[PDB]
Amino acid sequence: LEALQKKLEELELDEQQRKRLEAFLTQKQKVGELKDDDFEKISELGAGNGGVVFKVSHKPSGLVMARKLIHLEIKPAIRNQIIRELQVLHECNSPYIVGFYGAFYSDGEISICMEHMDGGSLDQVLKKAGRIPEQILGKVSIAVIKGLTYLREKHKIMHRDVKPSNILVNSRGEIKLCDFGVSGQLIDAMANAFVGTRSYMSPERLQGTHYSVQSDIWSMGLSLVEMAVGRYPIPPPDAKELELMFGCPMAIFELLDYIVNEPPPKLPSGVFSLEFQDFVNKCLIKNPAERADLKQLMVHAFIKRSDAEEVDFAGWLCSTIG
Amino acid sequence: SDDWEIEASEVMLSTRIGSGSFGTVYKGKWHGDVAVKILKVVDPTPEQFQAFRNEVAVLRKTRHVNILLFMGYMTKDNLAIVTQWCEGSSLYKHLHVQETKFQMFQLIDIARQTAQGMDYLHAKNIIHRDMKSNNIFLHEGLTVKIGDFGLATVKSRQPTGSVLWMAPEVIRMQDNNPFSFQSDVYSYGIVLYELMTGELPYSHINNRDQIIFMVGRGYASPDLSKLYKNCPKAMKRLVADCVKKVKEERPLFPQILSSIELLQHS
Ligand SMILES: CNS(=O)(=O)Nc1nccc(Cc2c(C)c3ccc(Oc4ncccn4)cc3oc2=O)c1F
Ligand SMILES: Nc1ncnc2c1ncn2[C@@H]1O[C@H](COP(=O)(O)OP(=O)(O)NP(=O)(O)O)[C@@H](O)[C@H]1O
Numbered sequence: 001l002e003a004l005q006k007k008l009e010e011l012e013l014d015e016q017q018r019k020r021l022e023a024f025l026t027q028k029q030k031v032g033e034l035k036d037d038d039f040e041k042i043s044e045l046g047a048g049n050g051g052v053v054f055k056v057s058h059k060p061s062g063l064v065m066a067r068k069l070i071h072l073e074i075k076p077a078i079r080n081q082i083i084r085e086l087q088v089l090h091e092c093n094s095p096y097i098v099g100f101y102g103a104f105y106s107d108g109e110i111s112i113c114m115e116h117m118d119g120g121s122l123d124q125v126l127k128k129a130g131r132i133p134e135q136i137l138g139k140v141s142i143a144v145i146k147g148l149t150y151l152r153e154k155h156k157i158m159h160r161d162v163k164p165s166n167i168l169v170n171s172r173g174e175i176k177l178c179d180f181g182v183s184g185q186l187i188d189a190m191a192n193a194f195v196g197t198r199s200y201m202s203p204e205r206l207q208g209t210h211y212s213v214q215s216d217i218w219s220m221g222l223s224l225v226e227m228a229v230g231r232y233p234i235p236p237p238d239a240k241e242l243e244l245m246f247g248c249p250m251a252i253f254e255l256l257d258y259i260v261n262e263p264p265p266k267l268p269s270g271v272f273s274l275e276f277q278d279f280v281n282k283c284l285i286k287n288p289a290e291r292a293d294l295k296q297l298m299v300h301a302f303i304k305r306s307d308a309e310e311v312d313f314a315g316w317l318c319s320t321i322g
Numbered sequence: 323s324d325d326w327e328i329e330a331s332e333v334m335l336s337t338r339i340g341s342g343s344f345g346t347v348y349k350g351k352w353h354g355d356v357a358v359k360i361l362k363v364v365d366p367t368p369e370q371f372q373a374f375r376n377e378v379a380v381l382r383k384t385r386h387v388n389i390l391l392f393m394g395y396m397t398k399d400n401l402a403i404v405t406q407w408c409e410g411s412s413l414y415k416h417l418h419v420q421e422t423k424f425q426m427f428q429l430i431d432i433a434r435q436t437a438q439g440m441d442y443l444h445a446k447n448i449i450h451r452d453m454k455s456n457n458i459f460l461h462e463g464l465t466v467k468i469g470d471f472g473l474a475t476v477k478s479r480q481p482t483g484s485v486l487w488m489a490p491e492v493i494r495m496q497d498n499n500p501f502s503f504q505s506d507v508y509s510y511g512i513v514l515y516e517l518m519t520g521e522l523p524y525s526h527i528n529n530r531d532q533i534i535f536m537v538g539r540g541y542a543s544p545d546l547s548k549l550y551k552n553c554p555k556a557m558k559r560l561v562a563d564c565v566k567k568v569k570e571e572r573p574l575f576p577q578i579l580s581s582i583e584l585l586q587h588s
């Protein structure tokens with residue numbers, strides 16, 4: 001209640017961020033234990049390979065929320081432990097992490113109710129924008145680097161799934177992370193219950209060796225390339241396809257095999273800045289030890305440039321989706 | 323059409339049982355309890371209409387006590403298939419949710435009946451292509467019924483449910499058609515593993531993409547050290563034989579059946 005507000009003061013916020021975080025925590029106090037009966041469906045906000053996400057209204061509070069339905073057949077003991085482990089999200093209050101309201105189990109689906117983002121995922125944004133301008137990919141990078149270091153310091157947790165569809169954006173110009181690995185039982189359950197069409201997985205995680213947040217940095221670099229150019233990069237673009245996006249399919253195993261055997265993808269030269277190119281090249285180093293880490297990324301030239309560049313992110317977003 | 327199309331006014335949909343990505347399964351009423359699988363397709367293309375009537379034609383050829391009883395279809399309002407209702411739960415729920423205490427003689431019977439149903443399908447030139455313990459239902463607890471075969475014509479518009487039961491040749495997808503009687507045997511082998519261990523394979527790996535890579539390369543395989551101690555040593559051999567990485571080294575179901583039948587003669 002006010003134990004949440006004490007941990008706000010342990011973070012380095014500015015004037016406009018503390019305003020919004022304090023406003024969200026007060027709305028967290030309007031809602032109690034959530035149930036399937038408490039919600040009125042508004043619209044549908046996604047159809048991931050995993051579970052459908054609805055925009056919904058919580059009747060007692062009036063609040064609008066995003067409801068992720070995760071269908072899983074698990075014994076009741078695992079159900080209760082998944083909901084217990086998800087409660088750490090009440091304490092995950094940061095400008096770069098989407099908010100949490102509550103989680104519960106109904107029917108055969110775990111419901112996760114979280115902060116609504118009217119901008120959607122950058123996956124959804126990408127398919128409307130074609131490609132994302134580099135200036136904005138600088139601001140996105142900052143948000144991701146800050147969200148990962150927040151998780152590692154204040155929670156000792158990795159994201160484990162950094163992808164364009166797990167980065168969400170707000171009309172207020174906020175860029176936040178979502179769908180990270182809080183519950184170890186939920187991690188085990190979703191490996192057995194779904195299949196994937198693409199992969200942002202680090203080559204060391206594919207091979208079973210020891211991994212750290214460096215794997216998330218590799219995933220960020222792969223997401224940045226995919227958002228810079230307008231295509232997933234594991235199968236590098238053809239000499240033709242390059243000359244069809246700027247001017248002057250593989251099965252899941254073949255993708256995973258490529259990420260382990262062939263050199264990582266690169267940003268196409270000439271169309272992007274040299275620093276941004278060097279930035280993704282430092283993120284996509286295969287050996288995790290010689291890959292850039294989180295502090296090195298925050299002092300890289302591309303980040304100090306982008307942090308200083310005042311960009312109207314909120315404006316560009318409302319122009320390209322409406 | 324043909325005489326297996328059911329008018330929608332005749333069917334009363336009751337409760338919601340399961341909901342995957344390719345459709346939703348409701349319990350219903352149509353001359354007694356029935357199961358209705360409604361496909362998530364609101365604008366079915368003339369192509370998908372033909373693939374549906376084709377998969378229905380394949381369902382029309384199965385009449386066997388270990389195969390789920392096809393009963394009819396609906397093609398106007400929506401695309402759906404009507405089958406018998408199994409009173410028990412799926413084999414997955416028995417083994418991994420309820421954790422029901424089967425005895426050793428019951429596990430072999432489930433193994434034998436599953437092989438009996440699969441033998442029938444292959445004798446009719448039907449490849450399941452997506453066998454898991456989710457698709458094996460225990461009607462009233464005693465007799466297994468195999469379902470979720472067919473409609474591989476409409477699902478391709480490689481399975482997208484789970485990878486735990488996929489044969490390595492199917493995981494790699496290097497052929498245009500890696501599906502065979504032995505890819506089904508591998509899947510049956512993984513179900514045998516479930517039956518004889520009580521848990522799913524690769525329980526220590528929690529990364530689907532790791533599982534896909536490790537199993538496609540041959541670096542990972544079901545851990546047979548977790549087989550029950552009361553599991554007969556001939557049954558242990560059968561698990562290993564079905565799970566073999568080489569597609570041509572795996573037994574066919576006439577042999578699998580005989581292996582179990584002679585084992586069953588205690
Ligand atoms: C692909 N990587 S993996 O390691 O194999 N698997 C997994 N990776 C990450 C995660 C998971 C499991 C997982 C999911 C999917 C999740 C989704 C939404 C959520 O809600 C929420 N609310 C507010 C803010 C942030 N999240 C919390 C969540 O916690 C989890 O542990 C993996 F299963
Ligand atoms: N809190 C939220 N607010 C707004 N949109 C959300 C929220 N949570 C999820 N979404 C949307 O839900 C969509 C699908 O998400 P999800 O179901 O996680 O599948 P995915 O991320 O596209 N891939 P996978 O992780 O394999 O399921 C995303 O594109 C988001 O835009």
Ligand SMILES: CCCS(=O)(=O)Nc1ccc(F)c(C(=O)c2c[nH]c3ncc(Cl)cc23)c1F
Pocket residue numbers: 339347348357358359381390391392403404405406407408409410411412459468469470471472473
């Ligand atoms: C003859 C096979 C038809 S199918 O291959 O399309 N599979 C199918 C079709 C319709 C269904 F309802 C189902 C199904 O899931 C069930 C059928 N009977 C059941 N009884 C219990 C449960 Cl939990 C599930 C089912 C099902 F597996």
